[PDB]
Amino acid sequence: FYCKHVERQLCSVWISNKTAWFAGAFTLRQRMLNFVQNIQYYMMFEVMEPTWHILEKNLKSASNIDDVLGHHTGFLDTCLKDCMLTNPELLKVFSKLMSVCVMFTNCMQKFTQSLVSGFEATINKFDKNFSAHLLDLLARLSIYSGMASVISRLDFNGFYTE
Amino acid sequence: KSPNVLLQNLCCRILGRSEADVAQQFQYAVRVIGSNFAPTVERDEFLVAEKIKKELIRQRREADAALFSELHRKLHSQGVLKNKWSILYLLLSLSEDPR
Amino acid sequence: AAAAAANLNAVRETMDVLLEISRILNTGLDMETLSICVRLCEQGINPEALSSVIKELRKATEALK
Amino acid sequence: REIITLQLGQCGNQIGFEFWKQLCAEHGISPEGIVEEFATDRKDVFFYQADDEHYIPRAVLLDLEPRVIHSILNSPYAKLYNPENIYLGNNWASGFSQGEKIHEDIFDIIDREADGSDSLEGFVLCHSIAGGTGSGLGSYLLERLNDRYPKKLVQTYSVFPNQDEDVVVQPYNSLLTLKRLTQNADCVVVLDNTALNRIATDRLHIQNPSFSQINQLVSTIMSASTTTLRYPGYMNNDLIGLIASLIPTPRLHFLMTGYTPLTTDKTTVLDVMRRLLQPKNVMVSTNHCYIAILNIIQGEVDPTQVHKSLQRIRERKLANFIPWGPASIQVALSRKSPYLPSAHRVSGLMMANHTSISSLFERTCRQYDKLRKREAFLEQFRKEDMFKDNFDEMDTSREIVQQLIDEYHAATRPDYISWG
Numbered sequence: 001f002y003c004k005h006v007e008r009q010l011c012s013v014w015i016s017n018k019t020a021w022f023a024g025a026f027t028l029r030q031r032m033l034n035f036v037q038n039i040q041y042y043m044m045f046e047v048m049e050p051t052w053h054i055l056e057k058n059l060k061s062a063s064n065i066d067d068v069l070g071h072h073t074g075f076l077d078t079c080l081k082d083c084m085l086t087n088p089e090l091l092k093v094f095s096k097l098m099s100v101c102v103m104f105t106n107c108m109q110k111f112t113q114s115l116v117s118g119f120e121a122t123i124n125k126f127d128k129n130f131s132a133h134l135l136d137l138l139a140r141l142s143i144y145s146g147m148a149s150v151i152s153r154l155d156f157n158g159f160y161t162e
Numbered sequence: 163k164s165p166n167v168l169l170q171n172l173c174c175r176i177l178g179r180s181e182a183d184v185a186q187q188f189q190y191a192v193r194v195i196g197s198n199f200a201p202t203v204e205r206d207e208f209l210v211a212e213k214i215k216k217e218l219i220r221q222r223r224e225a226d227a228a229l230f231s232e233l234h235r236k237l238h239s240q241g242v243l244k245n246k247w248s249i250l251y252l253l254l255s256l257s258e259d260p261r
Numbered sequence: 262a263a264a265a266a267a268n269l270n271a272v273r274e275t276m277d278v279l280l281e282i283s284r285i286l287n288t289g290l291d292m293e294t295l296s297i298c299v300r301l302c303e304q305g306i307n308p309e310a311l312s313s314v315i316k317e318l319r320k321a322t323e324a325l326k
Numbered sequence: 327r328e329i330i331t332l333q334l335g336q337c338g339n340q341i342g343f344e345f346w347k348q349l350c351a352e353h354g355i356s357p358e359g360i361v362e363e364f365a366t367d368r369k370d371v372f373f374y375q376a377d378d379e380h381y382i383p384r385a386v387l388l389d390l391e392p393r394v395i396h397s398i399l400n401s402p403y404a405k406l407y408n409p410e411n412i413y414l415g416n417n418w419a420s421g422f423s424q425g426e427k428i429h430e431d432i433f434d435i436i437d438r439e440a441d442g443s444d445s446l447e448g449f450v451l452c453h454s455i456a457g458g459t460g461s462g463l464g465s466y467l468l469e470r471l472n473d474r475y476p477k478k479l480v481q482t483y484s485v486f487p488n489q490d491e492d493v494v495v496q497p498y499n500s501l502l503t504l505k506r507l508t509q510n511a512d513c514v515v516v517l518d519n520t521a522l523n524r525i526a527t528d529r530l531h532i533q534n535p536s537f538s539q540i541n542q543l544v545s546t547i548m549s550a551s552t553t554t555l556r557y558p559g560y561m562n563n564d565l566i567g568l569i570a571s572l573i574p575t576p577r578l579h580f581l582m583t584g585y586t587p588l589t590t591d592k593t594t595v596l597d598v599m600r601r602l603l604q605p606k607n608v609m610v611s612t613n614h615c616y617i618a619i620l621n622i623i624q625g626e627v628d629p630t631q632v633h634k635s636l637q638r639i640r641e642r643k644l645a646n647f648i649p650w651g652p653a654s655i656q657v658a659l660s661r662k663s664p665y666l667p668s669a670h671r672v673s674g675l676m677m678a679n680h681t682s683i684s685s686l687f688e689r690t691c692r693q694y695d696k697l698r699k700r701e702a703f704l705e706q707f708r709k710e711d712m713f714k715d716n717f718d719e720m721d722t723s724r725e726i727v728q729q730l731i732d733e734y735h736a737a738t739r740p741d742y743i744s745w746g
Contacts, residue, residue, distance in 0.1 A: 007561075007567065010570075011564075011566040011567060011570050014566075014570060014573075015477075015479065015512065015566060016477075017576075018512065018576045019476075020472050020473060020476065020509070020510060023575065023745070026574065026575050027574075027650070027651065027742075030574050030651060030653065031651065031652075033570055033571065034571055034652070034653060037561060037567070037571065037656070038656070040560060040561060041561075041656065041657065041658075044560060045629055045632060045633075045657070045659060046629070046633060049629045050629045050630060053629065149633065152636070152637075152640055154652070155652040156640065156647075156652055156654035157647050157648060157649075157651065157652045157653075157654065158652075159649075159650070159651050159652055160652075165301060165304055165306070168297065168300060168301060169301070169314075171297050172294065172297045172298070172301070172314075172315075172318075173318060175293055175294040175297055176289075176294060176315060176318035176319060176322065177318060177321070177322050177325075178322065179325075184325065186321075187317075187318055187321055187325075190314065190317055190318075190321075191314045191318075194310055194313055194314050194317075195306070195307075195310050195311065195314065198307055198310055199305065199306065199307075200305060200307070201305075201307050201308075201309075203309070214282075214286065217286070218285065218286075223285065226285040229281070229285060230282065230285060233278055233281050233282050233285075234282075236274075236278045237275070237278055237279070237282075240271050240272075240274050240275045240278070242268070242271050242272055242275055243275055243299060243302070243303075244302065244303045244305070245302050245303075245305060248302045248305070248306060248307075248308045249279060249298060249299060249302050249308070250282075251308040251309070252298065252302075252308035252311055252312055252315075253279070253282055253283055253286050253288055253290075254286065255308060255309070255312035256286070256288035256289065256290070256312055256315060256316065257286045257287060257288065258286075258287040258288070259287075260287055262708070263420070263707070263708050263709065266708055
């Protein structure tokens with residue numbers, strides 16, 4: 001739900017910002033929306049749907065209830081644990097990046113004038129804060145023990161590789 | 163307009179002069195055109211076309227006599243001229259023989 | 262309009278094709294005069310009457326010279 | 327949310343007619359609108375739940391010299407959509423001026439249907455570029471829509487005017503319309519008439535009825551693109567999410583069309599991915615590199631197949647990359663529609679932002695530059711003279727399309743901190 005809320009914010013910025021100032025936030029917004037959409041594509045189409053379709057094969061071929069109970073518990077436990085939910089240190093950089101997202105969209109919605117430099121400076125401050133944490137996410141996930149799938153989803157060109 | 167002042171235009175077009183410079187020639191125009199406004203002779207465009215071809219054979223511009231076969235067709239193709247006969251008789255009447 | 266100028270195209274065409282007919286019979290009328298000569302014929306007029314006037318006006322531009 | 331579809335011109339009403347017939351056959355409705363017994367879906371995206379138990383689509387019917395629109399009138403699909411708003415050529419200036427003098431009541435027609443639906447997501451314009459009937463009026467209405475409503479989306483399904491063609495004012499008309507498209511639209515979907523013509527003369531041996539078969543193609547593409555909105559997924563159940571990833575900046579908003587079967591008249595995701603990435607399964611036919619691709623697939627998809635297919639697409643490198651960033655082909659999965667013919671059970675389509683369309687733009691610019699240098703092909707159209715006696719709008723449109731070509735070439739560079 002938090003990940004959907006920020007998607008709404010990020011699309012709102014692009015549609016309002018087009019008036020019929022700067023391109024510094026264009027590339028920053030292109031790195032935020034194409035981040036959060038891909039966490040959804042991964043988190044669903046690798047964890048949720050495969051195991052759910054196998055769990056429909058567990059609800060045709062299993063003859064008792066104490067199999068089905070364990071199968072269900074395993075699907076829930078993996079759908080948390082293979083993500084950022086009950087990770088032991090949570091990968092706290094995700095909350096920090098989402099905080100930089102919500103601050104960026106809040107400032108970018110006030111693109112209406114009636115200083116362009118003050119907006120440009122706070123957007124670049126956010127750009128440093130964001131780009132550092134995106135590289136920190138890629139590093140912190142790469143060391144943690146499936147990696148290459150979400151890494152290749154997040155960057156494919158290798159414009160950043162760390 | 164009226165045809166009487168439009169004939170004065172013709173008298174400015176053939177000559178190279180203003181209309182207050184000469185009034186004699188426009189008086190010749192109004193004396194000949196006047197008391198006649200309607201042809202009292204045979205009316206057919208087809209006969210005057212057969213009189214233009216007959217005239218171009220007599221002058222040995224017989225390739226131009228096959229041009230007139232196309233130009234009369236073009237004249238029919240536009241179709242915005244009320245009397246095709248009067249201008250063909252008029253253009254036939256002023257014909258010179260350079261041979 | 263647009264078609265109301267297409268009729269103006271079809272009149273300039275009439276005027277040009279009658280000039281080709283004018284040169285192959287070798288008359289002295291040019292384009293500007295021929296545009297008067299077609300206008301007169303729409304009301305209807307004797308070419309037998311007009312030819313003598315034109316054959317006098319071409320005989321009165323070198324005699325009034 | 328809800329989409330209100332606008333159709334205008336003979337070609338635009340043709341493609342809207344075939345698209346509405348396609349969605350009528352697709353969803354569980356009669357040509358009157360009578361509900362079926364087989365219909366995770368939605369019937370509120372193009373359709374209003376209208377007030378005689380017919381899901382009447384919200385369509386603006388515009389006619390200008392109607393010939394085929396009369397055939398649309400006496401038709402069984404005139405019982406599906408007719409909110410009774412039909413209100414009355416061969417030039418951009420004529421259609422522009424005619425749209426200018428009557429903008430009020432057609433804007434009231436737009437206001438009526440805008441009040442008709444509860445929510446709104448965008449305006450999809452059935453448009454033909456330099457189609458004569460669609461041209462001019464479409465550009466003027468594009469100005470009216472983007473000026474009057476700045477909070478919504480504007481989509482324009484557009485053809486590229488090359489039909490192996492006589493009209494010599496067509497580069498001027500397409501240039502002025504393209505100026506309006508770059509400046510007054512949020513996103514433009516462009517197709518090539520010659521590409522679809524080549525594909526149609528390939529798959530069959532038809533030469534004369536090319537128009538109607540091209541209509542089948544664009545209607546199938548338009549249904550395929552909005553399947554993810556019409557059927558509830560997880561993303562691109564609104565237009566702006568699909569519009570967002572492909573468009574990196576307000577100037578590059580022109581999208582190529584792909585769809586991996588050219589056939590509907592066994593298969594896996596892996597094969598159709600590698601079959602999609604060639605430029606001859608693209609229905610739009612130096613370094614040329616995509617900005618961003620997005621593919622949507624619909625079928626009996628094993629979820630491991632998209633995973634290892636995207637693996638193969640990476641290490642093969644069969645797609646053109648983006649220098650200044652990551653923005654790549656994204657796998658989207660959608661539901662197979664009820665009552666669609668069972669050929670190519672796994673079927674995908676793609677929408678992509680490519681710099682190769684700059685070549686087609688500069689070709690048409692070169693045609694305009696040739697006819698403009700010769701100065702014998704304006705034909706002295708009276709509406710063109712009275713609209714602009716100085717013809718400075720052609721110069722302004724040329725400047726805008728030149729800036730567009732420069733921004734395309736600048737996005738091609740590894741630096742896009744250099745602009746145009």
